[PDB]
Amino acid sequence: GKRIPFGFKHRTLPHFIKDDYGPESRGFVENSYLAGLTPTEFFFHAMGGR
Amino acid sequence: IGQRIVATLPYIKQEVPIIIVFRALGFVSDRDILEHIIYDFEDPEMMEMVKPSLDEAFVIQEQNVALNFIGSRGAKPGVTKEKRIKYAKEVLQKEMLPHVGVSDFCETKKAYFLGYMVHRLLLAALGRRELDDRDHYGNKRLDLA
Amino acid sequence: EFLEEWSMENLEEISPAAIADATKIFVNGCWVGIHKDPEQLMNTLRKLRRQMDIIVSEVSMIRDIREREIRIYTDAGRICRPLLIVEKQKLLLKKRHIDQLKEREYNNYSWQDLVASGVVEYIDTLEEETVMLAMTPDDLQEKEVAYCSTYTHCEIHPSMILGVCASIIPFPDHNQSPRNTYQSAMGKQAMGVYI
Amino acid sequence: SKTYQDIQNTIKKAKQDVIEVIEKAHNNELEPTPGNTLRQTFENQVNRI
Amino acid sequence: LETQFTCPFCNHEKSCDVKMDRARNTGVISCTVCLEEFQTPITYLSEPVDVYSDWIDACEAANQ
Amino acid sequence: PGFVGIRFCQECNNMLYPKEDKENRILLYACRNCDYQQEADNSCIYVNKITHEVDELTQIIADVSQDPTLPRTEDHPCQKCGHKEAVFFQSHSARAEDAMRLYYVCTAPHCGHRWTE
Amino acid sequence: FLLGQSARDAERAKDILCRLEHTTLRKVTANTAIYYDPNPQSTVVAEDQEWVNVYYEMPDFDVARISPWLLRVELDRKHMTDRKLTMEQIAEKINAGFG
Amino acid sequence: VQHWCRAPRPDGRLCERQDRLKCPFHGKIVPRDDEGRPLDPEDRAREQRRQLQKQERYPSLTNLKAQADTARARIGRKVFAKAAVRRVVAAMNRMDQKKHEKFSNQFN
Ligand SMILES: [Zn+2]
Ligand SMILES: [Zn+2]
Ligand SMILES: [Zn+2]
Ligand SMILES: [Zn+2]
Ligand SMILES: [Zn+2]
């Protein structure tokens, strides 16, 4: 029920800078299933499905 | 109802106030112990976090007394004194924190490491660091053939 | 041993007044010394590792910075993966290397010569907490609003975050995730030639 | 293509508003709603956007 | 930890028991069989096994 | 108010517990262990901040400017050394999770100036 | 469910609210300290000395019985008002409980 | 806080205390004139009645009850009760519950 959690040290992943509260950083997928998903959206989507 | 820190050593039948475990390692005066636990004497809050535990065991003030105190817990009740102090010394060297060292005269190392353990605990309680996550894989080791 | 040759100050030789500002140093969890200039020590050591010097490749090396510890691991069981190393804003992997690998079968310029030349680096789950990964060498390109602009590593390719059965799925990123998980589980029941 | 452009424009709008909200909160310009702390109000507003 | 100890003198196991008078900071250990009785101060950390081990040293020390 | 710190004996180095000199009605710091005695200075013995009004600037260490993982911004020039670039970040401590206020630190070598907004 | 006009206006409802909710002293205290004051006429603290000497000169309560040891407690305003509350009632309660 | 206690003090002065509801030294605050008489005659009669009611109302060896019969013993009995310490421990554990709530965004 919450956005993706900060599992690294104030980072959702090591591709983002620290204390990043943007929509991309916490797991907003701005793509359709027909446009693909960029690798970080793929990982966050995996977490939700799990 | 002040917070009182204690340690659970291996092969000692009861919990033990940590300040005792510092006495039994030969750092007898109070200030020498707070040199090893509190790496900076300016933060008052951690000092009054440590005060209660430094009161809890004001009674035991010398290395051999604390070694008695520890070894009285342990193997079998009715045992001579010298065996009791040998027991406590054997524990605090061989069994407690081996990775720091099993050889003798590893007591300044052992005291610094135990002070580190307590420092980390006090930060966790004052909130200056986050509680360790269990499912972080940095903390885990895969155990191959 | 190398640390002793450097300006490490072993622990049984310190006045406890000094620890306040210095940086601690743990080698496999054992508080081994202290040091006064951390960053130079870290750069020295990472350089030594990058040269295949005394520090073997699989030696994780973290630097907690808010708290003042440096931690070095050599134990067994840690998991790690190779990444590309980044200069200021540029990979160290030039086309010299691609040229020499392309004839990997004549020059015997293998992968080992590629780690040996300070181009890839094994970074493990705990040292990742302190890197900044470019997903692809385009993140390096100076953007209109440079996102981070101080990257440390790159991914070799994003698609190597998948496994042996999930690497069969074609276009896995157009699928909903439980679909990919079932296919992973049904690709192990599929009659073929097993040997 | 027209509806693709609509969709992209809506997404750009939404991300811009979320950036605005963030920098408000960075300037101490955001004030909690009744029954909710600052973290929770911040999160609730971003999720609503 | 346990509380009943072999009498150091009559060698009867579990025949010694202790009374910790926390009011006076003094604990007594008494052998029911031989009626031997040992008195000694206690502090708020002390336990029966600590008291007992004062007795043994008192026995040996006087037996020197 | 201000917090109150411990002070140690000069024979034992043990912590000097307080008590009162009733016949003089003045505060003495004494040693439970040795028989050393000292005359006090505070006249206060205990303090609790129920609100927990801790300022994080003390917790900040000027070395955090080295982090590559940590945001860099050009807009806020350093007040002290006049440098252009400075890192910034959240509070990130228990009892301080609210208040997404930012803390700024200069990124010049050996300037180490820190401030807030 | 509120019964009377409290159903309609918010203020009456909030009154009833604060009259249900439990409010121990911690919730309405800023900070406390245990001073050593032998002489009430001369507090260690300065900012309190005014109302101090306003109280201690009139001998409704004995000065001889008083011990030199002190509690001083700080109340913060916005909390203090949220429960629509005043030091009179807290004084009253402390009288009631310990006598 | 406008109205003043204004009760007649023994020194002839009127109280200047700014209490919202009650004077700690004169009970309930009633509105008084410049010379301290309550404006309401009924309130004055009630105050007079209350004042009248208030005005109306082995020996050589030590007695152990002297220690048992003292304020300090009473307070010690009250505070050092198993119920009281249990409530104290419960409240302090709820304090611990808040400092457990000091990890919002991350895993904790
Ligand atoms: Zn016997
Ligand atoms: Zn002393
Ligand atoms: Zn600067
Ligand atoms: Zn009055
Ligand atoms: Zn009055």
Tab-separated table of N, CA and C and ligand atoms in Angstrom, chain G residues 58 60, chain H residues 5 7 9 15 17 19 23-27, ligand 5:
chain	number	residue	atom	x	y	z
G	58	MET	N	3.831	35.928	50.840
G	58	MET	CA	2.609	35.741	51.606
G	58	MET	C	2.620	34.334	52.198
G	60	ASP	N	0.756	31.757	53.294
G	60	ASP	CA	-0.322	30.779	53.389
G	60	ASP	C	0.230	29.368	53.544
H	5	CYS	N	-8.265	38.363	41.001
H	5	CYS	CA	-8.755	37.708	42.210
H	5	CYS	C	-9.316	38.729	43.188
H	7	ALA	N	-9.263	39.503	46.103
H	7	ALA	CA	-9.765	39.197	47.430
H	7	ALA	C	-9.045	40.059	48.468
H	9	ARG	N	-6.642	40.718	51.075
H	9	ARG	CA	-5.519	40.036	51.692
H	9	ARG	C	-5.366	40.485	53.141
H	15	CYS	N	-5.955	41.139	45.869
H	15	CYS	CA	-5.168	40.240	45.037
H	15	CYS	C	-5.180	40.685	43.582
H	17	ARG	N	-3.810	38.565	41.216
H	17	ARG	CA	-3.527	37.326	40.508
H	17	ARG	C	-4.426	37.220	39.283
H	19	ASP	N	-5.748	34.635	37.341
H	19	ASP	CA	-6.178	33.271	37.065
H	19	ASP	C	-7.503	33.280	36.320
H	23	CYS	N	-8.698	31.398	42.233
H	23	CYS	CA	-7.502	31.840	42.931
H	23	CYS	C	-6.967	30.691	43.776
H	24	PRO	N	-5.677	30.352	43.682
H	24	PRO	CA	-5.158	29.279	44.544
H	24	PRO	C	-5.274	29.597	46.014
H	25	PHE	N	-5.425	30.870	46.363
H	25	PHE	CA	-5.374	31.331	47.739
H	25	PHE	C	-6.713	31.871	48.220
H	26	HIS	N	-7.687	32.011	47.316
H	26	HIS	CA	-9.019	32.501	47.654
H	26	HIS	C	-10.126	31.653	47.045
H	27	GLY	N	-9.831	30.420	46.647
H	27	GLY	CA	-10.836	29.569	46.043
H	27	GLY	C	-11.373	30.118	44.738
I	5	ZN	ZN	-6.072	33.955	47.163
